[PDB]
Design a protein around this ligand. Structure first.
Ligand SMILES: COc1ccc(-c2ccc3sc(C(N)N)cc3c2)cc1OC
Ligand SMILES: COc1ccc(-c2ccc3sc(C(N)N)cc3c2)cc1OC
Ligand SMILES: [Ca+2]
Lengths: 235, 57
């Protein structure tokens, strides 16, 4: 996250970090005790990818951290139906053993298709991660967050040569300087409603982070809420 | 009442019903209060809420 601020412990208790052949390479969010939602581009491979819930500072021990192995990865069936589009950039990860929900490990709420879109359209959400703190720069040690404004679709369309689908949205500041960045991908875009946070997007992609006239691109979660619900049922 | 105006006063979700509309509802982990509008935690760690004190010092 470029130009954000340190989260406090337990401020985003649905946030997780993904580790593998690279540490902290992507974020995700807790759907329930057994399931994480993330970006499919993060998990095109699975070799001992590990999830850490209850994380705050990546170089220290807080004694809130819950580490789990991923046993199953389900990318959206239509992801990679079209080469290099990032269309349908969402995936589910099933954990080997359930998380123990507590104040530092709590799911994000997921509303139905209609209300996720309503909540998105409220026009302000929070984004968080341990991604780069400057474009082409280093990664964050303490979890970062940032309020990003929703950007109107026509503006976003003009901001890039790349295709922006109906399954995506843009968010950010016209002046640049503050943005999501690489390493943040897969993490939550969330909208707080009377103190309860709902998942409204997945941090997906972008061009140079925080550059004026460029915006973060997010997966429109409303389009995928029925699929998430269907896949992540507990028995 | 309609869902049109201030979400039928529903804390979370609103659906229009015959004329005297508004039936409010809540997401998993919450229950509709007797008050019929607000949403009460029905579990120890309900989704989407911060429970670690953020005001420290
Ligand atoms: C050096 O500037 C950059 C230029 C391009 C990109 C970049 C990264 C990922 C993706 S996915 C995608 C697509 N969905 N078409 C387009 C695109 C562009 C990132 C940059 O910096 C972070
Ligand atoms: C190949 O290198 C890559 C480099 C960067 C990214 C990547 C990932 C997330 C975000 S958010 C953002 C923003 N401007 N908000 C820009 C950006 C760029 C993806 C890549 O490939 C998967
Ligand atoms: Ca730590």
């Amino acid at each position: 996250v470029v130009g954000g601020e340190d989260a406090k412990p337990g401020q985003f208790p649905w946030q997780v970090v993904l580790n593998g052949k690279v540490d902290a390479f992507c974020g995700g969010s807790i759907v329930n005790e057994k399931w994480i939602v993330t970006a499919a581009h993060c998990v095109e491979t699975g070799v001992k990818i590990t999830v850490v819930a209850g994380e705050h500072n990546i170089e220290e021990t807080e004694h809130t951290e819950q580490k789990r192995n991923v046993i199953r990865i389900i990318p959206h069936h239509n992801y990679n139906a079209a080469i290099n589009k990032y269309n349908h950039d969402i995936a589910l990860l099933e954990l080997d053993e359930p998380l123990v929900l507590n104040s530092y490990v709590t799911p994000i709420c997921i509303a139905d298709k209609e209300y996720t879109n309503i909540f998105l359209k409220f026009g302000s959400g929070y984004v968080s991660g341990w991604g780069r703190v400057f474009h082409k720069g280093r990664s964050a040690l303490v979890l970062q967050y940032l309020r990003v404004p929703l950007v109107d679709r026509a503006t976003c369309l003009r901001s890039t040569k790349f295709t922006i689908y109906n399954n995506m949205f843009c968010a950010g500041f016209h002046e640049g300087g503050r943005d999501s960045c690489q390493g943040d991908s897969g993490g939550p875009h969330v909208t707080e409603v009377e103190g309860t946070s709902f998942l409204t997007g997945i941090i997906s992609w972008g061009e140079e982070c925080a550059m004026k006239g460029k915006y973060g691109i997010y997966t429109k979660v409303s389009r995928y809420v029925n699929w998430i619900k269907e896949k992540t049922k507990l028995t | 009442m309609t869902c049109n105006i201030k979400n039928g006063r529903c804390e979370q979700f609103c659906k229009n019903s015959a004329d005297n509309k508004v039936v409010c509802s809540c997401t998993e982990g919450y229950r509709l209060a007797e008050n019929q509008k607000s949403c009460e935690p029905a579990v120890p760690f309900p989704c989407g809420r911060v429970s670690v004190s953020q005001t420290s010092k």
